Amino acid sequence: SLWVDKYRPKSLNALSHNEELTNFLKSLSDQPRDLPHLLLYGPNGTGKKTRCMALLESIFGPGVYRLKIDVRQFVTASNRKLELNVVSSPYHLEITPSDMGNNDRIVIQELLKEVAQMEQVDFQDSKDGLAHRYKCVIINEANSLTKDAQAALRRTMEKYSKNIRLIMVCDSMSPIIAPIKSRCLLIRCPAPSDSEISTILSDVVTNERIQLETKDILKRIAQASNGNLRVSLLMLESMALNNELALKSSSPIIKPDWIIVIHKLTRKIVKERSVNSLIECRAVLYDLLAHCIPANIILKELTFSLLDVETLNTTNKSSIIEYSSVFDERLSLGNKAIFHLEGFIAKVMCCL
Amino acid sequence: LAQQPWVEKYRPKNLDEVTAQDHAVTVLKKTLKSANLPHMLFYGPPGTGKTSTILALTKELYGPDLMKSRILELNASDERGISIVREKVKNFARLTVSKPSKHDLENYPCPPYKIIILDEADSMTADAQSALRRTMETYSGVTRFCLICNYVTRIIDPLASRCSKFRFKALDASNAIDRLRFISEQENVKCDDGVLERILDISAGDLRRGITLLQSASKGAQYLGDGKNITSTQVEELAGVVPHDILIEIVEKVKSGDFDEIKKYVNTFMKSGWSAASVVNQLHEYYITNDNFDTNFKNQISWLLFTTDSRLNNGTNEHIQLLNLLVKISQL
Amino acid sequence: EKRSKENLPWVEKYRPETLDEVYGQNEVITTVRKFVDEGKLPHLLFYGPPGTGKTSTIVALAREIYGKNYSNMVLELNASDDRGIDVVRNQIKDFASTRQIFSKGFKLIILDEADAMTNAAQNALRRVIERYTKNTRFCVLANYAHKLTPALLSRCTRFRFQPLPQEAIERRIANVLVHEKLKLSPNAEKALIELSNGDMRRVLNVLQSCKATLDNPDEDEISDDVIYECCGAPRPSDLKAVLKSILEDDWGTAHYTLNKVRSAKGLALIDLIEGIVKILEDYELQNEETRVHLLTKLADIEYSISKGGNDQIQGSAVIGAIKASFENET
Amino acid sequence: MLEAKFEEASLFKRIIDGFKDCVQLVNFQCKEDGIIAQAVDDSRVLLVSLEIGVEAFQEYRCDHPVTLGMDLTSLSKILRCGNNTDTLTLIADNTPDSIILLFEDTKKDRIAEYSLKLMDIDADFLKIEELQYDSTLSLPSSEFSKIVRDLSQLSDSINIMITKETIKFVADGDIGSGSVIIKPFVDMEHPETSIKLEMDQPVDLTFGAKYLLDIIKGSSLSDRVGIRLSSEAPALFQFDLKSGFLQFFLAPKFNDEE
DNA sequence: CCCCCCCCCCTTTTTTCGGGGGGGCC
DNA sequence: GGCCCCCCCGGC
DNA sequence: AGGGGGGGGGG
Numbered sequence A: 001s002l003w004v005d006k007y008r009p010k011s012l013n014a015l016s017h018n019e020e021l022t023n024f025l026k027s028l029s030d031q032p033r034d035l036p037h038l039l040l041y042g043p044n045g046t047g048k049k050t051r052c053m054a055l056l057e058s059i060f061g062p063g064v065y066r067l068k069i070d071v072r073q074f075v076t077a078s079n080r081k082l083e084l085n086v087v088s089s090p091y092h093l094e095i096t097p098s099d100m101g102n103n104d105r106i107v108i109q110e111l112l113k114e115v116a117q118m119e120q121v122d123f124q125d126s127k128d129g130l131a132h133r134y135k136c137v138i139i140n141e142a143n144s145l146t147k148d149a150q151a152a153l154r155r156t157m158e159k160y161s162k163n164i165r166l167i168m169v170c171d172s173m174s175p176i177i178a179p180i181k182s183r184c185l186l187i188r189c190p191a192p193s194d195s196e197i198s199t200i201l202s203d204v205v206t207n208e209r210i211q212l213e214t215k216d217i218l219k220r221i222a223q224a225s226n227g228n229l230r231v232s233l234l235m236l237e238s239m240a241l242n243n244e245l246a247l248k249s250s251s252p253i254i255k256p257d258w259i260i261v262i263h264k265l266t267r268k269i270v271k272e273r274s275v276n277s278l279i280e281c282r283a284v285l286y287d288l289l290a291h292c293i294p295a296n297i298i299l300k301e302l303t304f305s306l307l308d309v310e311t312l313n314t315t316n317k318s319s320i321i322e323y324s325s326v327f328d329e330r331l332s333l334g335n336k337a338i339f340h341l342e343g344f345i346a347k348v349m350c351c352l
Numbered sequence B: 001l002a003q004q005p006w007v008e009k010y011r012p013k014n015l016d017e018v019t020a021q022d023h024a025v026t027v028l029k030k031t032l033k034s035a036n037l038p039h040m041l042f043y044g045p046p047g048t049g050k051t052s053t054i055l056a057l058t059k060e061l062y063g064p065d066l067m068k069s070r071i072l073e074l075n076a077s078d079e080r081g082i083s084i085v086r087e088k089v090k091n092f093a094r095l096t097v098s099k100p101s102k103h104d105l106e107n108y109p110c111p112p113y114k115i116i117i118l119d120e121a122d123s124m125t126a127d128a129q130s131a132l133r134r135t136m137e138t139y140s141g142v143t144r145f146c147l148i149c150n151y152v153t154r155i156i157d158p159l160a161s162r163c164s165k166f167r168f169k170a171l172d173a174s175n176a177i178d179r180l181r182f183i184s185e186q187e188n189v190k191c192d193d194g195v196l197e198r199i200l201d202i203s204a205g206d207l208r209r210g211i212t213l214l215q216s217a218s219k220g221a222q223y224l225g226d227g228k229n230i231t232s233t234q235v236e237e238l239a240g241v242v243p244h245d246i247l248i249e250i251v252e253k254v255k256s257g258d259f260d261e262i263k264k265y266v267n268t269f270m271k272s273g274w275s276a277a278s279v280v281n282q283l284h285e286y287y288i289t290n291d292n293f294d295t296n297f298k299n300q301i302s303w304l305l306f307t308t309d310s311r312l313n314n315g316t317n318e319h320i321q322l323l324n325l326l327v328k329i330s331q332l
Numbered sequence C: 001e002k003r004s005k006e007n008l009p010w011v012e013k014y015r016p017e018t019l020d021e022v023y024g025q026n027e028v029i030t031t032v033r034k035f036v037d038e039g040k041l042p043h044l045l046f047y048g049p050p051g052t053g054k055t056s057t058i059v060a061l062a063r064e065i066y067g068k069n070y071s072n073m074v075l076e077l078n079a080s081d082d083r084g085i086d087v088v089r090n091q092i093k094d095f096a097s098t099r100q101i102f103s104k105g106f107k108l109i110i111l112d113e114a115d116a117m118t119n120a121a122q123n124a125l126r127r128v129i130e131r132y133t134k135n136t137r138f139c140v141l142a143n144y145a146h147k148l149t150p151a152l153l154s155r156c157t158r159f160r161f162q163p164l165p166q167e168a169i170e171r172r173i174a175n176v177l178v179h180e181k182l183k184l185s186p187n188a189e190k191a192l193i194e195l196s197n198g199d200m201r202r203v204l205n206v207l208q209s210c211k212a213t214l215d216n217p218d219e220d221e222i223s224d225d226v227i228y229e230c231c232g233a234p235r236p237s238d239l240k241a242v243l244k245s246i247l248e249d250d251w252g253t254a255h256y257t258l259n260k261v262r263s264a265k266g267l268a269l270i271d272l273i274e275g276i277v278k279i280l281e282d283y284e285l286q287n288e289e290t291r292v293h294l295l296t297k298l299a300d301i302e303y304s305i306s307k308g309g310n311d312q313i314q315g316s317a318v319i320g321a322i323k324a325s326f327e328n329e330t
Numbered sequence D: 001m002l003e004a005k006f007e008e009a010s011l012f013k014r015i016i017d018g019f020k021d022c023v024q025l026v027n028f029q030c031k032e033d034g035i036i037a038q039a040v041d042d043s044r045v046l047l048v049s050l051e052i053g054v055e056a057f058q059e060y061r062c063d064h065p066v067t068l069g070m071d072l073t074s075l076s077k078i079l080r081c082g083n084n085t086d087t088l089t090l091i092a093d094n095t096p097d098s099i100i101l102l103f104e105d106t107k108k109d110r111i112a113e114y115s116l117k118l119m120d121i122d123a124d125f126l127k128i129e130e131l132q133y134d135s136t137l138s139l140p141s142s143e144f145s146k147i148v149r150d151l152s153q154l155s156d157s158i159n160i161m162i163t164k165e166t167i168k169f170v171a172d173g174d175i176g177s178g179s180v181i182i183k184p185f186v187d188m189e190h191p192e193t194s195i196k197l198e199m200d201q202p203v204d205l206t207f208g209a210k211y212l213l214d215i216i217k218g219s220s221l222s223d224r225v226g227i228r229l230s231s232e233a234p235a236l237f238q239f240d241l242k243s244g245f246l247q248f249f250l251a252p253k254f255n256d257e258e
Numbered sequence E: 001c002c003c004c005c006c007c008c009c010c011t012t013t014t015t016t017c018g019g020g021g022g023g024g025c026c
Numbered sequence F: 001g002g003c004c005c006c007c008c009c010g011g012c
Numbered sequence G: 001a002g003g004g005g006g007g008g009g010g011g
């Protein structure tokens, strides 16, 4: 198993960063009977899901980590059979309705209400066989849900408050509607500091018997992660595997392929500004999009790589950021990602 | 009970527990003795007590026995297409009223009509909405309609004209402090002076959010086990409010005007997880209330903040929008 | 209905039963009366905005033509019912091609809210209308003319229902006061007309709310304050003060005045914007771009408000837009 | 090493058909005593228990208990192609990746033996410890069909109330309400249409149209049913086998008003 | 058989409710 | 004869 | 617009 997965903490006491958040979670779990619905928000790869699992383990027994995967069948208005992969536990449930796109609402209107409208059989840790507690449902990536699903959830989280509890994890609250925010308890999860990431990496190294001459090595990985911990662990593993389990002071930082492609696109746009260059950029964008690279991430990385060019001036950067801001909203309100990415690239090339 | 959230535990049960909606609660209470309740359209900002108000009205009108047989409630969690509206709603409206029992006729007014509550009516399609226009009018003598929405513009003009409009005002510290204080005393929560007012100000017209924040603060105080009174700094921390020091650094960086420094500071700041909406609101407050800026600067910054808020309300990336707003302000 | 008519809402309780109880449509009423008095009744297309009395007018016309037992001698189809191609092909054709049952007479079909009908049904109805014209007549009620096919429009005589005039609303208000034994101050009447915008349903709803608001209707007179409290609409004085502070006073005091006015009675920003727009529409501006900026920025703010967002930022934006637009006056 | 020569293969076909809809992956523990199985519904709301004793089988023997997670849909696929009257056997080996179903017959020509793949399904130490159930009874299945199919068209609730000398099925909905009462009725000439009922305390529990409709679809297995209702434990619907039975612990619906 | 005007014809699939048509089970 | 299911437009 | 293909005129 990968080091990023083998050393994941499984309890609130095993957390190594954001001690204030750990204390808040412990306070919440002290009396879980009256726990309101929870909404965790923060940067990606910081440990929101791990903290949610730790909170669940604090509430229920260690048995929350025995997970299974089942398949659920759904029918739309056109008699279309859709399959949903449901991750379930004896004490909690996990769902990702966004996998069904615009049909996510169905999951809200068929699955959740099925669980919240009636009780469950609990033949373990019980005398009568019926559950005497609530069930925690984790809706992963709540920001990806359509507005209709959230509107349907509005009453579901209220009329079954003491039978079902919702813990929703997201990286941004902007897509979330106001009623859902009002019905949830907001929990902010700051990204770990550089020192904490370095300490975690050092612990992994010393528990994996990896030779390291200077600790500053790990520090660089942290400056290459921009607060992300999963990226830091994966980069450490890749560097160890590429350097015969021995990191050197001259070891370079390993970047993912899509980042290199975006850098190529940026430094081709900067160097050449022509219609043929735009056609080549269209081909590059098609290649990037066809391989499961979200359009928003592509736009963000392209904008922040353009702003890092040392030849551009303040006016060019201001124009680029304004165009990026406009085209982000255009993407949010559109279907064809390239239809907006091409427009953004053309505007950037014109403004240069 | 003890196994329910404070927002649900302290949900109003009767019409006398509504705090700042007297302009409509008085009319609803008068309808009990007048028995001429018209079609109602409850609109207002989230967390003002519309569904609670209608539930309390239905209870006080019918009783726990007749509630089930006299109320039909449909919300966004049920299919409400044109076919559903034309079949199920029409059938229920055209049905005769259930016969009350002598107990109910003795202890309750028992009005001679039933109520259909279409919660979250703003999510219904225009075609489906158009099918109720004659349904409400034809069966007005046996059925009454309650449409609850957050955006009044989402309701077609004919239905708004047919329904009597009721606007629910925002719950601020000047009209909702009594309920929060009563909840605090009931839960034996000890708070410093001005803590409840700060909570209500942060809520900005949402009593549900204020109650949730109070519950979280009480849980934290109980876990601490020190007996000290709850302060405002802890409340602000629990509400995701950016510290004043960070705001001061942000405005100083904006005043510096350098693009690279602003970009680097924004990159560092976005790693803390602060919501963009709160940052924009705090910046708007600080800049508008400051007396160190001229008329033109405020004129431009107001429009810039409005545009940024409108763009953020559409579900966009917070980093790009915040960086663009700060860059634009720095060039004002 | 149940019990008596006193339990009905005022919108439905005061529904006209005869044609002489319809106000504000003297021309149309006289024309239809003359048509039904001498046998030349053509196909009718009543086009108008909500709350004008088209449905009431057609119901009264049917009652006058047929009598008390008019419900069993007419075919009334509305959006609440299913009106597809099959329905038009079978039920409407049978009704138009068949004699009466209860008593001798011609067939009447009332397609209320026909603007919500499919194009196929409208195309099918053309020959049904043009073939059974001898013994059948068609009446179509609409609020939006763009939803009706040109072929259907060509076969119907058009009658437009204008917004209710001031005098008609005053007469209806007087009748309602006489029936309900209520007293209304003249200023309250003017405010009711101003906020009515030509819809009688709004008049009835607001009057019922005001009556319910009174401590004792027997010896209490409704004033403008009562209407404003019931509807929550801003008072004209508050709007004038807010506009004055925005125009002449500085940023801080204008913001303080707006916040105080809004928090005094829990006023909503959209109503304040609408009142300011109405007030400024009569301003004799010396430049055009100032009006252009005012209109564009206020429309943008209204659109943003319609989707929600931060209210304080929206109010600050309104103030800034007004100040910037008026800066062009110089 | 293990054989379960059946008296009738149709008995096993109906046994499997009785709970194919409720669950699809169920562990079968084949001990010398017989076959035991208990599967939790994928929603963790319904427990399908089942056991067949050694008496039911024409000839059953086993040397070492073995747990097989073999599928149910494949079971139906295998058994549907068979004839009516046969003596199905379940032979296997020490390390079975498949189980050979010997469809033996008295005649030497009507043989349709097949092979069914085996699949690894995890099993837990589930417990069905008995509780002081308030009411328990048994009655035929034709009445169950005529009542459930009738009440499903009027509502989604098949609420069951069991009072002294009274058994009530209640179903209210938008169209209206429907209630059917069955009472102790014994026929000397036709004992099969009789109810054997014993209750200790009154019980009332609301149950669902889809669950009972699915259950009565599989009611062809046993001509008699078994109701067991308590006050705080999941009431169970059972179908008696030749020597065992097939139980269904179904959780009652939550009540919001009370 | 080989070459030169004069024009014609081909370069090609994904989609959110609601309604209609037309085929297949029964 | 009735469901049930699949394919196809949708502006003037 | 670019490329392939058929038919009348020259060769």
Ligand SMILES: Nc1ncnc2c1ncn2[C@@H]1O[C@H](COP(=O)(O)OP(=O)(O)OP(O)(O)=S)[C@@H](O)[C@H]1O
Pocket (backbone or CB within 6 Å): A179, A182, B006, B007, B008, B010, B011, B012, B017, B018, B019, B020, B021, B044, B045, B046, B047, B048, B049, B050, B051, B052, B053, B149, B150, B179, B207, B208, B211
């Ligand atoms: N007027 C009020 N008086 C007392 N408590 C209120 C009031 N309004 C809201 N609350 C409290 O906040 C909780 C939620 O109120 P809601 O009825 O859900 O508000 P809402 O208007 O229905 O929100 P939306 O528009 O449907 S998102 C209630 O259970 C109460 O505890």
Ligand SMILES: Nc1ncnc2c1ncn2[C@@H]1O[C@H](COP(=O)(O)OP(=O)(O)OP(O)(O)=S)[C@@H](O)[C@H]1O
Pocket (backbone or CB within 6 Å): B158, C010, C011, C012, C014, C015, C016, C021, C022, C023, C024, C025, C048, C049, C050, C051, C052, C053, C054, C055, C056, C057, C142, C143, C172, C200, C201
């Ligand atoms: N001319 C009128 N005179 C008196 N009352 C009127 C008049 N017009 C409308 N009303 C009142 O408003 C109520 C509703 O009138 P309607 O006939 O429903 O208007 P409408 O034009 O048919 O609405 P639409 O176009 O279908 S949305 C009536 O019962 C009357 O009480």
Ligand SMILES: Nc1nc2c(ncn2[C@@H]2O[C@H](COP(=O)(O)OP(=O)(O)O)[C@@H](O)[C@H]2O)c(=O)[nH]1
Pocket (backbone or CB within 6 Å): A004, A005, A007, A008, A009, A014, A015, A016, A017, A043, A044, A045, A046, A047, A048, A049, A050, A051, A169, A200, A229, A230, A233
């Ligand atoms: N040692 C340690 N590692 C953590 C902690 N929190 C997160 N991690 C590591 O960081 C990885 C990614 O965290 P993750 O839950 O995916 O964050 P999310 O995707 O934003 O919700 C995890 O797999 C862990 O290995 C912690 O508190 N202590």
Ligand SMILES: [Mg+2]
Pocket (backbone or CB within 6 Å): B050, B051, B052
């Ligand atoms: Mg609500």
Ligand SMILES: [Mg+2]
Pocket (backbone or CB within 6 Å): C054, C055, C056
């Ligand atoms: Mg009408």
